[model samples]
Target: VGSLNCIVAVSQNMGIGKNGDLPWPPLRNEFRYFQRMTTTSSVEGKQNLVIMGKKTWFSIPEKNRPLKGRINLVLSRELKEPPQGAHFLSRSLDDALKLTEQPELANKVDMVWIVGGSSVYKEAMNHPGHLKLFVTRIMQDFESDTFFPEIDLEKYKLLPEYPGVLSDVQEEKGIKYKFEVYEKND
Candidate 1:
């Protein structure tokens, strides 16, 4: 596996989801930030790989299944074939990472991103190749059943600023949030 990163929006309580969807209303600019980061590729002719669990995959609206230019890799043990617009299907996170190392995909895949449900995030966080985390910290608390996995401060340190990331707190629809990036120290 190449560099693996994660993108998530969490409430003050570290809650990420509620009822299988985002607890808070959509933040258009934040969404744009995610699109820009994940779609941008350092190498020309290469695309990024977004690996998400089955629930997270289905959570996206049907119209946006392929998610434009990026390649979609859905992880599922029950699914026999790739979903409607997904490019690949893997039984586990390890299997998904192996795909990126394939001769045919190695050159084409620039980065691997874990866009998650809880289990996927937990697995990705502990992965030896996991390098960065793109997090949107929502200032307010919301009732949620799904939470983001706790990050080990010793392993990942927060950065004051990151290229292509806005360092200021952003306010949308009365909600205050900020984009934060953490780099793995080990």
Candidate 2:
């Protein structure tokens, strides 16, 4: 009965490596740091669910499958068995929306976050519904075989930017990021 919405959190242009590492290990760790920074108190317990691609699911250490608290939705073209805590499996963003809009599922939440391994982000970003993006730009020049799709600034307006902490990271690799939100033109 409430609004249907989505959010996305990711480092631009990155891919998952074998066994839950970023294909580039350093970038994986860097991405995790961004995750912690962006996902703190402000967004926690906000009735938001998380949806990700198969590669993204595998990117999470096996022990950490099905991130806690929020509903975990995995979208896969081939996988049949959803991990223990996944709410469901979807073949595409539209399929995921259908699952969420079901009366049974809709009553439990208001929004979902598309956390991904490239392809999912590309497709999800172009969705016609409202979307919020959390992009963490790392200073390291990672050689990525896969990448986040280019976002058209003309379509999305900047929303906010939160500075980052650099206590443990190298000054060159230490970086800042921002949160951006957008709505489709009527």
Candidate 3:
């Protein structure tokens, strides 16, 4: 099972957010990188699926969500239905992953991208599969309460080169950052 992939932006201390929002000011190119990875399809006529937790869903600006060129699914045991702009809803990461296998959706789903808010990232990291992380190293640190978990380097390797990835350090809004891909070993 090429399990699941996660995309996250973290500060020097691994912090991902403050309160319910990003700690740093917006970075256009950084976001462009995010959109490019999650929205691009590997196979013709197929699309990627983006899975995130409930809070992650709402964290996005209401008008800019459902993420546009891909299928969006949110995980939440509490929501009775998909949120106003979302396309699907599941009770857990396992359930959401299974939903992609359903006959109605299996054909259309290409890569599964996990964009998160913490607990969801934890579970996705543990799920068995040929996983990868499109992690952005926000070189500058910020005061944030929400953080991404440590990358178990024993289990994953950061490749030296990843196609289409901006491997060189990129600077934007006076902050320095770089893109890294962590491919699961074995």
Candidate 4:
């Protein structure tokens, strides 16, 4: 199985979305933080895989569908072919995970990131491989119907600080947020 990680932004109430779009205003630095984490690779010539649900895939504008520098894998049972610019289309999360382990692709891939809708995020939490969570804790609430799944505190422990991560609170457009990492306990 591929090493699985998640990147998400949630409000104080754990809200993540509203009507298929982000509930909060855009934070330039936070967006940059996401791009850096998802795009960076430790192995030369290797790239990361970003797995997202169909809804999440469509949420991004067509011009940015594939999210440059990463292999896009969109999960969708209804699709007969991969969406334009997407490297692969999967019927389930397991199918997507297996693709990363294939001999032909394994060495070329560094990590798998679950960039989500609610169901996809929940599914990734139960993945067999090691899981790391990159979370942005937005310090305010918004009117949102979609939410990030509850994480088990006992199973995942918060890190005080992580390399290449900002340790202090970040403020953008007068809104305060913090970057956090949680690693699953062995």
Which residue pairs in candidate 1 have backbone atoms (N, alpha carbon, C) closer than 3 angstroms, thus clashing? none
| 13-34 per-residue lDDT for model 1 (tens digits) | 9999898889899888888888
Candidate 2: regions farther than 4 A off: 1-20, 23-46, 160-186
Better of 1 and 3 by lDDT: 3
Of 3 and 4, the candidate ahead on lDDT is 3
| Poorest lDDT segment (10 consecutive residues) of candidate 3 | 1-10
Q: How much RMSD separates candidate 1 from the native structure?
A: 1.2
Pull out the clashing pairs in model 2: 13-148, 17-23
Off by over 4 Å in 1: none
Q: Could you give me the TM-score of model 4 versus the true structure?
A: 0.95
Superposed Cα deviation of residue 154, candidate 4 (Å): 0.4
The RMSD of every model to the true structure, in order and in angstroms, is 1.2, 4.8, 1.3, 1.3
Better of 1 and 4 by TM-score: 1
Q: Which ten residues in a row have the lowest lDDT in candidate 2?
A: 168-177
Q: What is the C-alpha lDDT of each candidate?
A: 0.88, 0.58, 0.90, 0.89
Question: Which tens-of-lDDT digit does each residue in 156-180 have in candidate 3?
Answer: 8999999999778899989999999
Q: Which prediction has the highest lDDT against the true structure?
A: 3
TM-score of each predicted structure versus truth: 0.96, 0.70, 0.97, 0.95
